Write a protein that binds this ligand. Structure first.
Ligand SMILES: O=C1N/C(=N/N=C2/C(=O)Nc3ccc(S(=O)(=O)O)cc32)S/C1=C\c1ccco1
Ligand SMILES: O=C1N/C(=N/N=C2/C(=O)Nc3ccc(S(=O)(=O)O)cc32)S/C1=C\c1ccco1
Ligand SMILES: [Zn+2]
Ligand SMILES: [Zn+2]
Length: 55
């Protein structure tokens, strides 16, 4: 099982902020960006990132 493109549950767990294994952004010690770790856009935290995509 996995939720992302990467092995974030499948054997390993992978951080969304810094991209390294063995932890999650809640447990991470790296500096936090001016935007979302889940889509990359500014002005929100990734739990407010609930809206649908479009084209
Ligand atoms: O509630 C929260 N969930 C979060 N989930 N972040 C993830 C990440 O970096 N890698 C993951 C791999 C697997 C899963 S999963 O558990 O398999 O979906 C989740 C994650 S961060 C957070 C709160 C928080 C507060 C301050 C900083 O972060
Ligand atoms: O409690 C939570 N905090 C979260 N904060 N998200 C952040 C993000 O994406 N980029 C940031 C950059 C700076 C800061 S900061 O505001 O400067 O620390 C926070 C964030 S996510 C979360 C719970 C969660 C559950 C499911 C998905 O996410
Ligand atoms: Zn990290
Ligand atoms: Zn987002």
């Amino acid at each position: 099982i996995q939720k992302g493109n990467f092995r974030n549950q499948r054997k390993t767990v992978k951080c969304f902020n810094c991209g390294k294994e063995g932890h999650i952004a809640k447990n991470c010690r790296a500096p936090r960006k001016k935007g979302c770790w889940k889509c990359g856009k500014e002005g929100h935290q990734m739990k407010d990132c609930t809206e649908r995509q479009a084209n």
